[PDB]
Amino acid sequence: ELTAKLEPAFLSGLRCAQPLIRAKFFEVFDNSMKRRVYERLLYVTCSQNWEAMGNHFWIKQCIELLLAVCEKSTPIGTSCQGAMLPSITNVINLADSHDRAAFAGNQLHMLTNRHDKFLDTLREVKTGALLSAFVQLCHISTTLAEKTWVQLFPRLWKILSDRQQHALAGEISPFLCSGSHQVQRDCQPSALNCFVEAMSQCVPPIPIRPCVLKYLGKTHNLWFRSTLMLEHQAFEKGLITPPQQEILDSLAELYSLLQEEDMWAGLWQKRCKYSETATAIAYEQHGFFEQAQESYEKAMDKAKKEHERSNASPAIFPEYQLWEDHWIRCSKELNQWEALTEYGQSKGHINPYLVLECAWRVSNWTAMKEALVQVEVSCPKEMAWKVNMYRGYLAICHPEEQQLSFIERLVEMASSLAIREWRRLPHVVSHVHTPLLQAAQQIIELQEAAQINAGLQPTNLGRNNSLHDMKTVVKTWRNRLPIVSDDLSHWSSIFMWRQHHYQAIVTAYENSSQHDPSSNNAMLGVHASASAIIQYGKIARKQGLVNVALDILSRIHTIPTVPIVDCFQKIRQQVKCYLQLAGVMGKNECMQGLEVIESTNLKYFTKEMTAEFYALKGMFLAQINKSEEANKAFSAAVQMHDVLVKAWAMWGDYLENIFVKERQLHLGVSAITCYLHACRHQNESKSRKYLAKVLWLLSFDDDKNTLADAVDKYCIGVPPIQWLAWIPQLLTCLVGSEGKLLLNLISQVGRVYPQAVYFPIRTLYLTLKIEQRERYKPIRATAPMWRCSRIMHMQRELHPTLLSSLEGIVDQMVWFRENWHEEVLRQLQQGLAKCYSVAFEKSGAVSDAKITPHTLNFVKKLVSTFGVSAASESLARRAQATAQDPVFQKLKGQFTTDFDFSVPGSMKLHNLISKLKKWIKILEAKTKQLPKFFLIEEKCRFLSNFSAQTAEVEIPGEFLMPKPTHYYIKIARFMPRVEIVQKHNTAARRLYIRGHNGKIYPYLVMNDACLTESRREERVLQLLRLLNPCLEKRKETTKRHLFFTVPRVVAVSPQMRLVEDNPSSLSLVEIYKQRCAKKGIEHDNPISRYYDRLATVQARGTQASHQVLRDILKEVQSNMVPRSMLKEWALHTFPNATDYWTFRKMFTIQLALIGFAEFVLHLNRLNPEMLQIAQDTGKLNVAYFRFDINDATGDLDANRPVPFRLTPNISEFLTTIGVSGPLTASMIAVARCFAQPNFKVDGILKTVLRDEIIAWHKKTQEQPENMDSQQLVSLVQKAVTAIMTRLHNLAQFEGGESKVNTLVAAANSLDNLCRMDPAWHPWL
C-alpha cells in the first residue's frame, strides 16, 4: 500500500528539476515495464494515472519512456543520404572507370594520421548518446517535447501491427475521456492537446467520438483541430444516420461556440428538414431579425401541427432547439427584453439564465435576484464572469440591497475569470474573442458606475470632487462607444447600464435640490440619458431595425424636460428613419417624414438646426417629385446656414438629377457650385462622393467649357487633399480640352502634394511623347504636353530637391531592367498565351487552324529583335557588349531557324504552340543559371547613397488614397540587396525600402510593354480602393471582415511601375506547377489533352458536343489534375490547425469579394495566374483585373459561361460548407452594402468608366479633339447601368433567397466549367 500511496512523490521524482533525481526515478520507472513499444504505449494510455503530475507537461516522460526502447549501441546514422556531407575520397567514386584505373610528404602524412584518429573517434559515436541528450533537451524545452511527440507518435503507430493498432485505439478512446486530464485544462499547451494532435496525424486514423472531439476542442484548446477533424469525418460520411447526426451536431456546436455564424448557417441550411429553418437562418444571418423571428414562429406552428399527428423523432430535436435559441436571440436583437423576462419566468419552463440576462434591463431587480440565486447554484464555467458582473449589478442598483463595498472585488474576480476564459481560446484572435472583448468594457463600466454611485451618497453629494468625477465618467462614457459590427444586444447592455446610472444622478440631484439650485447636475443627468437613448436609436437605425429605432426614440417623450439639442437629434434620427423606410416603401414614408418636420416647432431651434430641417424637407420633397418645393427648401436651408455641407450636397444632387434629364447647362453649373461648396472642408472621406459627381458632370460640357469655367471659379477654397484620389481623373481631364481651365487646380495640388502629382504627370507626359513619335513616324509639343511641362516646371521650381531626388530614383530604375534571356522568355510566354486564346477562338477547327497576322508579326518581331541620361547610354553600351556573346548569336540563329514561316506546316497554330513550349523550356533552363540577387552598389550609386538627408521622400503609394493623418512613411534607406523573383510570368526585381519607422517595405520594379493595359489595371485598382471605405461603414460587412486587398501600384514611367510586394505570395498556377513538378508531369498537359481530344472528335467529321467537353474535363480531373491539389497544398503548408482555419477563412472571404467584383464590375476573366495568394495571411489580390470593354462597341460584355472562378480545386479546399456559408453570405453582404443609396457608388462608377471609355475611344476610334460628349455620356451610362443592374440583382434579398446562390451554383456547375477556355484551367 505504501508504493500506492507514494505515487505523487514518484511522479514528482520523474518531473524533478534536478537531473540526478530525475534519472534515478526514470531508471526505476524504465525497469517497471518491458522494453517494448506496444507495452509502453499501453502503459501511458491505460496504466499511468497522470493526475498526480499536476500542471507538468508529462508528454516529456512519454518521450523519455519510449526512446529508451531504441537500440543504443548502434552506430549513429541517417536515412538522409542526400543531405550527408560526402567523404573526402568520395570524388574517386564519382569519377569514371578510366580515371580511377589510372589513379590505381611528412606534414601531409601527419595530417592524414591525425585525421584518421579523429574519424576513428567519431566512428565510436553511438545512437544512445544522442538519444539521452535529446531526452534531456525535451525535458528542458516544452516546445521541443510537443513537436517531438507530434512527430514521433504517428511513426511509432506505423510500426505497430494491425492487432496492436486496433487494441491501442480502443484503449486510447477512453484515455482521452479520462478525468485525470482535467488538471491540464489551463495548461499551455495541455499534454492532452499534444496527444490529440499526435493522434490526428496517424495513418490509419484513430476513430474518436464526435462528442469527445468537441469536448476536447472546447476544453483543451483544440478548437480548430477538433473542427477540422469533424469536418473530415462529415465529408467522409457524405454529410440521416445517428452517427452522421452526432457528427453534424458536434460540428454545429463547435461553429456556434467559435462564433462562426456563416459556417454554422451553411451547415444548418444543408441539414435542416424544414424550409422555414433555412429561411429564418438566411434572414438572421443578414440582420433581418424580424423576418427571421416570423419564420421561426411559422416553423414552430408547423411543428406543433405535426405533433398532433405523431410524436417527434430525436433527430428533429436539434432543429427545435435551434428555433428556440435563435428566436430568443432575435428577440434580444429586436429589443424585446420585457417579453423575454416574462418568457423566462413562465411557470414550469423557467429559464433562469435568460431572466438573468434580461431582467436587469427592464429594472425587474427581484427577478434578477431570483435568477442570480438559481444561476449561482448551477452555472456554466464560461459564464462565471457574467455572474460576478450581475452580482455587482445587484449590489449597485437593487433598491434595498445596495452594497458598494463589494464592487472592487467583484470587478477583480470578473476580470480574472474573463482572462482565464481568454487563455482557453485560440491564439489567433477571431470572432470567438469578441464576447470577452465586449466584457472588458462592460466590467470597466461597472467599476466606473460604482464610482459614480459612491459619489451620489448623501455624504459625498454636492461636493466638488464628486461632481468632477461624475462629469468625467459621463464624458468618458459618451466618447467610449461600441462599434457597428456589434450586435444590438451589446449596445443595449452598455446603454441600459449607463441609463440606470444617469437616472440615479437625476434622482439624487432632484430629490435633494439644496445644493445646485440651478439644477445643472440634474440637467447633466437628463442630457446624458437623452443622448444615450438617441445613440441607441441611431445604432438601431444603422443596423436596419428602423421600427426598433422608432420605438427607442419615442422614449424621449417620456422625459418631462429635455434640452433642445437632444430634441433636435431625436427629430433628425426619426427623419433619417423615415428616409430609410421610404427607400423601399416610397411615398407614404416621405409623407410621414414631412409631417414630422412640419410638426417641429422651429422657434426654439437655432439657425443651423432650422437649415438642417429644411434640407431634410428638401430631400423628402425631392423623393415625392415635388421639385419646386424641394428647390425652395434647399435654397432656404443654404441661406439659413451657408456652411451646412449636407444642404449643399443634397441641393447639388437634386440639381444634378434635373440636369441629367433636361440638360440645361445652367442646372449643371448650379449643381457643380453646390457640390464644390460642399467639399470646402478637410474631411476628405465625406467629400469623395461629391467630387466624383463634379468630374462626371464635366462630360456634359459644351464647346464653350461652361462647366469647366464654373469648376475653375468655385474650386478655390477646396483643399488639395480632396483631389489626391482623383488625380488620374484630373490628368484625364487635363489631356482634354477642359485642361486649359483645370491647370490651376492641378498646379495647386502639385504645389501641396508634389510626389503625388509628379509620377502620374511624368508618366502621362512620356506617354504623350511616345504617341506623338508614333503619329509622326523634332516635333512641336502638343497642348497637353505643354500643360504637363508647366506642372512639372512649377514643381521643380517649388520643390527642386524633392523632384531631383525622385528623378534620381527613377533614373536608377533603368538598371533593374531584365536581361535578354528573361525578356525573350517573357515574350515567348505572352505569345503562347495569345496563341492559346486564338486556339480557343478556333476550337472548331483544330488541326486546320492557322496563326493570325498578329501572332505572325509578334514572332517576326521576336526573331528580328532577339531580346537585345548617362544611365541610359551606359545601359545601351552594356546591351551592345552583350550582343558580342557567341552563345547569344548561336541561340538567335537556331531560334530564327526554328521560327522560319516559309517552311511547310509552320503556319499551323498548334505547331507554333509546340515550338513555343520547347523554347520556353530551353530558356527556363537557361534562366535558372542567372544570379538571384544583385547589390545596389554595383550600379545604383544614388540609391545606395540615398538617405533622409537627401530629401523627405515618401515610400511609393502613400498618396494613392489620402491618409487620414499626416503620418506618411518616409524613405530612410534602399537595402543593398535587390532580389530577382519570377512573378506575373515575368522576371521582376524586388527592391527593399527601409522606412523612417524602421520597417522594410518590399517593392517590385516591373517592366510593361503595353501602356494602355497598365493604365486600365491601375484604373480597376483605383476603383477597388474607392469602394473599400463603404465596406468599413456597414454592419454585415464589418462583422465579416470584408475588404478588398489593393496593393500599391505607382507608375514612374510608361514602361515601368513600382508595385507593393508580399514576398510570401504565390499564384495559384505556381502552386499547380509545384504540384506537377513534384508529380513529374508537365503543367500544360491538360490543355494538350483537351485539344488532342477535340482534334480526334473533329477528325471523325463532327463537332464536339457538350458531352464531349464534359468527358474531357472528367478525364483531366481523374488523370492529371485531381480535385484535392489545393487542399493538399494547404494541409502541407499550414500544419497547425488554427493557421489552416484562418488561412481558409480569409481565402474564402477574399475570394467572395474578388468574384463579386469580377461579376458585378464587368472585369476580364480571373485566370489562375492572376490570383495571388498570400501565404502569411490568406489575403488574395488579383494581378490584374481590367474592364471587359468590347473593342467594337465600347460597352461592357463579361458574358462568360461562369460568373467567377469557383473551380473544383477551390471548391474542394473551401469545402461545401465554406462555399455555401461564408462565400455566399460575404457576396450577399457586399452586394447589399454597395447597393445602399447613400454611398452613391454610381457616381464613382461613372467617373471611373468615363476614363475607361475615353481610353477605349483613343485606342479604337482614333490640342487633340475630345470625343463626342453624347457618345461618351451614353456609353458610360450604359456601362454603369449594367453594373448597377448586376449589383441590384445580387442585393435583392426578398423571401430569404438570393440570386447569389444561383450564381454560385452556375460557377461550380461542371456544365459551365467544361465550356470555358482550357487556358483558364476549369479543373484547377
Partner 1 sequence: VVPPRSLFDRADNPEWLISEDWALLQAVKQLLELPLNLTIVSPAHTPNWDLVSDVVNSCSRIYRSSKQCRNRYENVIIPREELRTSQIYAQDENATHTQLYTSHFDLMKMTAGKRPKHASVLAESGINYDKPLPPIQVASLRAERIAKEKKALA
Partner 2 sequence: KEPYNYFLLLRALFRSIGGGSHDLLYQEFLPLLPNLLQGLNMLQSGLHKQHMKDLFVELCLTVPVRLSSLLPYLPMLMDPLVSALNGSQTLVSQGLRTLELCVDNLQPDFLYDHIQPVRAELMQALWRTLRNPADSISHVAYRVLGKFGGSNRKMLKESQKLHYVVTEVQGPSITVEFSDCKASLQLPMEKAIETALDCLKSANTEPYYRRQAWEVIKCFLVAMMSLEDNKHALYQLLAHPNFTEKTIPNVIISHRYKAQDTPARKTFEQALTGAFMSAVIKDLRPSALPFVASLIRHYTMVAVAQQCGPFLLPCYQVGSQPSTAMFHSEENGSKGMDPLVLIDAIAICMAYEEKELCKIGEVALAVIFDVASIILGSKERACQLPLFSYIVERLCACCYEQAWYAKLGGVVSIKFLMERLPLTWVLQNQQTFLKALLFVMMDLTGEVSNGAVAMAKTTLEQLLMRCATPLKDEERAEEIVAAQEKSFHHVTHDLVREV
Interface residue list for ligand IHP (CB under 6 A): 538, 542, 576, 646, 685-686, 1033, 1238-1239
324 lies in the binding site for partner 1 (CB under 8 A):
yes
- From the list ligand IHP, partner 2, partner 1, none, partner contacted by residue 482 (C-beta under 5 to 8 A by kind): partner 2
The CB-of-532 to partner 2 minimum distance in angstroms stands at 14
Q: Which is nearer to partner 2, 131 or 1284 (CB)?
A: 131
- Show contacts with partner 2 in window 941-970 (CB under 8 A): 944-945, 947, 964-965, 967
Tell me how far apart the alpha carbons of residues 822 and 834 are, in angstroms, rounded to a whole number.
18
Report the phi/psi class of residue 1178: left, alpha or beta, with left for phi > 0 and alpha for psi in -120 to 50.
left
Q: Does 361 bind partner 1 (CB under 8 A)?
A: no
Give least dist CB 1238 to ligand IHP, A.
4
Contact call for residue 554 and partner 1 (CB under 8 A): no
Q: Nearer to ligand IHP by C-beta: 678 or 1275?
A: 678
Residues 1075-1134 that bind partner 2 (CB under 8 A): 1078, 1132-1134
How far apart, in whole angstroms, are the C-alpha atoms of residue 1033 and residue 686? Answer: 12
Q: Which is nearer to partner 1, 193 or 1207 (CB)?
A: 193
The secondary element (H helix, E strand) that includes residue 1107 is helix 1106-1119
In angstroms and rounded to an integer, the radius of gyration of the C-alpha atoms of the chain is: 36
Of positions 21, 76, 211, 1095, contacts partner 1 by CB under 8 A: 211
Among 170, 204, 844, 1135, binds partner 2 (CB under 8 A): 1135
Residue 725: CB minimum distance to ligand IHP, A: 15
Contact 629, 642 (CB under 8 A): no
Could you say which of partner 2, ligand IHP, partner 1, none residue 538 binds, taking C-beta under 5 to 8 angstroms by partner kind? Answer: ligand IHP
Contact 910, 847 (CB under 8 A): yes
Shorter beta-carbon distance to partner 1: residue 173 or 1236:
173
380 binds partner 1 (CB under 8 A): yes
Residue 895 binds to partner 2 (criterion: CB under 8 A): no
Helix or strand (DSSP H, E) at 661: helix 645-662
Figure out which of the listed residues 677, 1019, 1039, 1246 binds partner 1, where binding follows CB under 8 A: 677
User: Could you say which of ligand IHP, partner 1, partner 2, none residue 444 binds, taking C-beta under 5 to 8 angstroms by partner kind?
Assistant: partner 2
Site for partner 2 in 176-195 (CB under 8 A): 188
Give phi and psi for 719, each to the nearest 5.
-60, 145
Whose Cβ is closer to partner 1: residue 330's or residue 1160's? Answer: 330
CA gap 996, 969 in Å, rounded: 7
Compare residues 45 and 763 and give the one whose CB is closer to partner 1: 45
Among left, alpha and beta (phi > 0; psi -120 to 50; other), residue 68 is alpha
Cα-based torsion angle of the residue sequence 226, 227, 233, 237 in order, rounded to the nearest 10 degrees: 150
Backbone φ, ψ for residue 665 (5° rounding): -60, -30
Q: Residue 89: which region, alpha, beta or left (left: phi > 0; alpha: psi -120 to 50)?
A: alpha
For the chain, first and last CA: distance in Å?
66
Amino acid symbol at 491: W
Q: Tell me if 1147 sits within 8 A of 1138, measured CB to CB.
A: no
| Binding-site partner at residue 542 among partner 1, partner 2, ligand IHP, none, CB < 5 to 8 Å by type | ligand IHP
The verdict on 778 binding partner 2 (CB under 8 A) reads no
Binding range to partner 1, per CB under 8 A, among 408-416, 487-495, 630-638, 1280-1288:
630-638
Bond prior to 654 in cis (omega within 30° of 0): no
Interface mask toward partner 1 for 564-603; x: CB under 8 A: ----------------------------------x--xxx
Q: Which stretch binds partner 1 (CB under 8 A): 66-74, 122-130, 193-201, 647-655?
A: 647-655
Dig out the grid coordinates for 573 from the structure: 434620427
Q: Which residue has the cell 484503449?
A: 171
Contact set for partner 2, span 441-470 (CB under 8 A): 441-445
Question: Look-up: residue for cell 456652411?
Answer: 643
Sheet containing 1180-1182: which strands, arranged edge to edge? 1065-1067, 1171-1174, 1180-1182
Closest CA to 873 of 814, 937, 823, 804: 814
* CA gap 795, 437 in Å, rounded: 49
Residues in the chain: 1324
Cell numbers representing residue 90 in the block = 568520395
Task: State which residue, 583 or 1002, has the beta carbon closest to partner 2.
Answer: 1002
In this complex, which beta carbon is closest to partner 2, that of residue 81 or of residue 561?
81
Sequence-distant (≥ 6) Cβ neighbours of residue 900 within 8 angstroms: 906
Question: Cell for 1006?
Answer: 516591373
Near partner 2 in 90-129, by CB under 8 A: 90-92, 94-95, 99, 103, 105, 107-109, 111-116, 118-119, 122-123, 125, 127, 129
**Per-residue binder mask for partner 1 (CB under 8 A), 24-53, x = binder:** ----xx--xxx----x--xxxxxxxxxx--
CB of 804 to ligand IHP, least distance (A): 39
H or E element, residue 125: none
Q: Per CB under 8 A, which region of 234-242, 409-417, 658-666, 745-753 contacts partner 2?
A: 409-417
Residues in region 130-189 near partner 1 by CB under 8 A: 167, 170-171, 173-175, 177-182
Interaction residues for partner 1, span 327-346 (CB under 8 A): 327, 336, 339, 342-343, 346
Smaller CB separation from partner 2, 129 or 312:
129
Nearer to ligand IHP, 643 or 779 (CB): 643
Q: Which of 971, 892, 988, 979 is nearest to 935 (CA)?
A: 979
Residue type, 447: Q
Closer residue to partner 1, CB minimum distance, 448 or 656: 656
Q: What pairs with residue 1157 in β-bridges?
A: none
CB of 354 to partner 1, least distance (A): 11
From the list ligand IHP, partner 1, partner 2, none, partner contacted by residue 60 (C-beta under 5 to 8 A by kind): none
Q: How far is the CB of 964 from partner 2 (least distance, A)?
A: 6
**Count of chain residues binding partner 1 (CB under 8 A):** 100
Q: 548 is written with which cell numbers?
A: 426598433
**Interhelix angle 488-511/317-333, nearest 10 degrees:** 40
Binding to partner 2 (CB under 8 A) within 987-1046 occurs at: 996-998, 1032, 1038, 1041, 1043
CB of 293 to partner 1, least distance (A): 8
Residue 642 to residue 450: CA distance in whole angstroms: 46
Residue 482 lies near partner 2 (rule: CB under 8 A):
yes
Q: Residue 307: is it exposed, middle or buried by C-beta count within 10 angstroms (0-12/13-18/19+)?
A: exposed
* Cell, residue 667: 442646372
Cell numbers for 673? 457650385
Binds partner 2 (CB under 8 A): choice among 12, 201, 245, 434: 434
Nearer to ligand IHP, 538 or 1286 (CB): 538
> What residue 776 binds from partner 2, partner 1, ligand IHP, none (CB within 5 to 8 A, per partner kind)?
none
- Which of 61, 631, 763, 1215 is close enough to bind partner 1 by CB under 8 A? 631
CB of 897 to partner 2, least distance (A): 26
* Residue 338 CA: distances (Å) to CA of 151, 369, 424, 1278: 56, 16, 34, 52
Cβ–Cβ contacts within 10 Å for residue 780, how many? 8
CB atoms within 10 A of CB 639: 12
| Residue 1238: contacted member of partner 1, ligand IHP, partner 2, none (CB under 5 to 8 Å, by partner type) | ligand IHP
Can you tell me which of 6, 428, 779, 903 binds partner 2, judged by CB under 8 A?
A: 428
